[PDB]
Structures are given as structure tokens and as C-alpha cells.
Amino acid sequence: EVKLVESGGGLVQPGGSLRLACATSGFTFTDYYMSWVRQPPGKALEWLGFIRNKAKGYTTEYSASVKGRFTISRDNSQSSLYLQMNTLRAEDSATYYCARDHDGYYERFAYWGQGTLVTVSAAATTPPSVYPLAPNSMVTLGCLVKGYFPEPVTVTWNSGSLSTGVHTFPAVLSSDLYTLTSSVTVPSKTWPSETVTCNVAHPASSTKVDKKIVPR
Amino acid sequence: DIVMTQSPSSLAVSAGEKVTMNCKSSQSLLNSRTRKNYLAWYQQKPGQSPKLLIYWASTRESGVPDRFTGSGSGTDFALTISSVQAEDLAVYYCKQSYNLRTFGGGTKLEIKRADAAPTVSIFPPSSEQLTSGGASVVCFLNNFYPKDINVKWKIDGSERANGVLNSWTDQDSKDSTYSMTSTLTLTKDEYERHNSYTCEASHKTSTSPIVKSFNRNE
Numbered sequence: 001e002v003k004l005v006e007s008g009g010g011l012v013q014p015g016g017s018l019r020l021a022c023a024t025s026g027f028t029f030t031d032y033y034m035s036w037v038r039q040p041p042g043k044a045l046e047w048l049g050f051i052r053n054k055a056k057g058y059t060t061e062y063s064a065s066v067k068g069r070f071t072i073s074r075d076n077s078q079s080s081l082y083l084q085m086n087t088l089r090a091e092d093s094a095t096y097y098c099a100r101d102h103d104g105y106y107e108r109f110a111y112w113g114q115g116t117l118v119t120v121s122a123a124a125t126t127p128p129s130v131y132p133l134a135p136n137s138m139v140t141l142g143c144l145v146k147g148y149f150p151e152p153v154t155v156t157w158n159s160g161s162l163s164t165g166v167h168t169f170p171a172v173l174s175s176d177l178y179t180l181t182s183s184v185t186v187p188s189k190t191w192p193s194e195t196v197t198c199n200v201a202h203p204a205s206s207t208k209v210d211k212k213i214v215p216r
Numbered sequence: 217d218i219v220m221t222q223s224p225s226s227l228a229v230s231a232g233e234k235v236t237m238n239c240k241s242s243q244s245l246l247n248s249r250t251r252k253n254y255l256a257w258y259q260q261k262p263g264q265s266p267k268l269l270i271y272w273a274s275t276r277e278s279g280v281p282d283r284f285t286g287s288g289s290g291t292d293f294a295l296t297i298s299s300v301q302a303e304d305l306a307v308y309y310c311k312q313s314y315n316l317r318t319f320g321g322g323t324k325l326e327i328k329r330a331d332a333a334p335t336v337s338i339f340p341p342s343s344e345q346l347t348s349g350g351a352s353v354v355c356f357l358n359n360f361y362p363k364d365i366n367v368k369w370k371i372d373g374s375e376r377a378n379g380v381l382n383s384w385t386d387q388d389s390k391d392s393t394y395s396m397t398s399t400l401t402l403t404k405d406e407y408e409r410h411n412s413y414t415c416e417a418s419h420k421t422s423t424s425p426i427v428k429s430f431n432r433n434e
């Protein structure tokens with residue numbers, strides 16, 4: 001299938017630089033224009049620029065908001081797309097996606113990466129503490145994932161094998177540290193008789209934690 | 217400058233109803249040559265990447281349910297959902313590609329459903345957190361409607377407002393409910409000074425608060 005995958009996202013100091021990369025497969029790379037698009041948390045998509053296909057000789061265009069500060073380039077031998085970002089400021093904090101643009105007929109972004117989150121801040125990387133939230137028909141368990149920076153963190157329950165009845169609440173920032181929690185609801189048949197574990201990852205500190213919810 | 221604007225900024229619609237959302241360009245997006253309007257519609261569900269629904273104004277991307285219809289021409293465009301389903305919850309963006317590309321500001325579509333009262337549970341601080349010197353007490357208010365809800369924390373029967381952070385999830389793609397977390401954070405020393413820890417949930421589905429409590433004498 002068509003696969004687009006951004007990477008390189010993370011914490012960078014205001015005034016600093018960062019380059020993202022976008023790995024693609026499943027289609028003829030040189031045929032396509034490629035675009036970058038960003039979305040600050042909670043806000044609208046914004047188109048940033050593109051680099052044209054072979055026929056048009058891989059020229060680049062930028063939106064006025066990043067022209068002269070961002071550079072796009074591609075590696076056709078590898079089917080890769082890049083974004084060089086410079087003199088970053090807080091307004092640049094956003095999830096950045098690449099998307100498959102024009103092939104010379106269809107006017108459409110048919111395909112999009114999962115996105116990679118960039119945070120522009122002077123605040124330091126801090127790993128989360130992870131705490132078990134333990135207490136009839138249905139029973140509700142949780143994990144409290146507290147004090148981390150920057151975003152994101154992922155939380156799954158039993159390695160992704162518990163999916164429904166999951167609520168992960170949007171982190172809230174206080175004093176330059178985020179906190180979030182996740183809840184899962186399972187029939188008390190299943191618990192504690194059968195284990196429940198939350199798996200928390202914090203890629204900025206490479207943190208991997210499992211917390212078994214044990215009855216008090 | 218091609219300026220793209222969308223309206224309404226947000227709206228709520230019950231399942232089965234019609235939804236119309238509009239997209240306005242500041243200059244025509246009709247390539248007089250080809251007679252195609254360079255306007256696409258995208259759908260971004262909560263937590264996901266945007267996804268293509270329509271291009272060239274009215275051409276429906278394969279895989280996209282037929283209840284979605286793009287229409288319009290020149291500077292005015294609409295996306296109409298003939299019969300909304302619970303999974304259609306999302307922000308919808310239009311995007312011109314006539315001169316480079318520019319997204320509109322988006323229309324956030326919420327689902328209206330019947331009122332539903334919240335399921336509340338409370339959790340004491342973990343021994344791991346306490347021994348490190350903090351105490352967070354957590355209430356989940358799960359699967360309710362509408363979104364507006366109030367929680368008050370009572371410690372030994374009295375109200376406390378300092379230290380409480382709330383966070384609502386995006387609406388659920390399946391049942392159209394919200395859920396919210398309320399977290400009260402104390403130091404170990406203050407947590408150890410009291411016994412009754414009470415989370416009270418006030419929602420329009422009842423005149424009577426839903427109250428979940430635990431006493432620190434475990």
C-alpha cells in the first residue's frame with residue numbers, strides 16, 4: 001500500500017533548527033509533487049510548501065508564512081521528502097504532516113503521513129511518573145501519567161489488546177509540565193482475575209513503562 | 217493571497233439529519249481552460265490525520281460514503297452530508313489548489329444525541345506516588361451528554377477548589393458521549409490530614425449530584 005511516515009519531530013529551543021523526514025513507499029516517487037502541512041495543537045491545517053515532480057524538475061514553492069526560513073528537498077533514490085526548519089519560534093509548535101500532492105492530473109492530497117509533533121520551547125525534557133488508578137457489572141481502571149514534557153505520550157492497555165471502553169484524556173499543561181490520565185472499563189469478570197496493564201511511552205525521553213493495576 | 221473561509225465554525229446535528237457546510241474563496245478557483253474548480257474537501261476525525269473526501273469540487277474520492285456530496289463553483293462551495301452518522305464527527309476543511317494551496321479555517325461538526333448521565337468513579341493516590349511525596353486524587357466522569365458538567369471536590373465534607381485540573385475528551389465516535397477527568401493534587405502532608413475525599417458530579421440529567429467518595433482509612 002501507499003505508506004507515508006514522518007519522523008524527526010521533538011523539542012527544540014526557540015531560535016533553533018530542526019529537519020523532519022518523510023519516508024514513502026507503494027507508488028512511483030518521482031511522479032508526485034510532495035507537500036508539507038502543519039497544525040498547531042487545537043488549530044487549523046496550514047499549507048507550508050511543496051516540491052514538484054520530475055517533469056517539472058523538482059522546483060519548490062513556499063507559503064508566505066515560512067518562505068526563506070523553511071527549505072524542502074527530496075531524495076529520489078530513496079523515495080524520501082525533507083523539511084529543513086530554521087529560526088524556530090513558538091508559532092512553529094505543531095504537528096507536521098507530509099502529503100502526496102499533484103501528479104499532473106489529479107488536484108488532490110490523496111495520502112497523508114500520521115504526523116510528527118514539533119514543540120518549540122526553552123523548558124527541559126522531563127519523563128512522566130506513571131501511577132496505577134485502582135478502585136459489579138463493569139469496572140473502571142486507570143493510569144495517571146504525571147509531570148512530563150514535552151508532548152506526546154501514548155498510552156495503550158494490555159499492549160493494545162484492550163481497545164474499547166478506553167478514554168485517554170488530553171494532557172493539560174501546568175508549570176511547564178503536562179499531566180494526563182487514561183481510563184479503561186472492563187467487566188469485573190475479567191479483572192482482577194485476568195491482568196490489566198497500561199503501557200505508557202514518552203518518546204522524547206525514550207521512556208517505556210508498564211503499570212499493572214493491582215487491587216488495593 | 218487566496219483567502220479561504222468556512223462557515224459555520226461549528227454546529228451539532230442529530231444522526232440521520234442533513235448537514236451543509238460552506239467554503240468561500242476570495243477569487244475564482246475555476247480554471248477557465250479545463251473548466252474544473254481546484255477545491256478539495258478533507259475530513260479530520262479526532263486524533264487522526266486529515267483524509268480526502270472530495271476534489272475538483274464535486275468528484276467523490278473512491279471509498280468515501282455517498283452521503284457526502286461536494287458542490288459549488290467559482291468562489292462558493294458546499295459539502296453536504298445527506299444523512300449524518302455518529303462516525304462523521306470531525307473538522308472538515310476545504311483547500312484551494314488553484315494558486316499553490318490554502319486551507320479554510322475548518323468546520324467542526326459535533327453530534328447531538330439524547331442526554332445521558334455520567335458514570336463516576338474515584339481513585340485514591342497510589343502508594344508509589346505518596347512515598348514520593350505527592351497525592352493525586354482522580355475522578356472520571358464517563359460517557360455523558362451534553363458536554364457541560366460541574367465537579368466539586370469535598371474534603372471532610374467541605375469544598376476545595378485549589379489544585380483541581382479538569383480535561384474533557386473529544387466526543388466519542390460511536391456513542392456520541394463525552395467523558396471528563398478531574399484531578400485534585402495535594403502534597404502528601406495535606407492528604408494525610410484528612411479522611412473523606414468526595415467528588416460530586418452535577419449534570420443537567422439530574423437535580424441530584426452524583427457523588428463518589430472514599431475514606432482514607434482504606
Ligand SMILES: C=CCO[C@]1(C(=O)O)C[C@@H](O[C@]2(C(=O)O)C[C@@H](O[C@]3(C(=O)O)C[C@@H](O)[C@@H](O)[C@@H]([C@H](O)CO)O3)[C@@H](O)[C@@H]([C@H](O)CO)O2)[C@@H](O)[C@@H]([C@H](O)CO)O1
Nearest residue numbers: 052056061102104105107247249250254313314315316317
Ligand atoms: C496558468 C497557466 C496555465 O497553462 C495551462 C492551462 O490550463 O491554461 C495549465 C498548465 O499546467 C501545468 C502543466 O504543465 O500541466 C501544471 C501547473 O501546476 C501548478 C504549479 O506547478 O504551480 C500546480 C497545480 O496544482 C496548479 O496549482 C497549477 C495552477 O492552477 C496553474 O495552472 O499550477 C503549472 O506547473 C503550469 C506551469 O505554470 C506552465 O508554465 O503547468 C499546462 O497544462 C499548460 C500547457 O502546458 C500549455 O497550455 O496549460
Ligand SMILES: [Zn+2]
Nearest residue numbers: 371406409410
Ligand atoms: Zn487541610
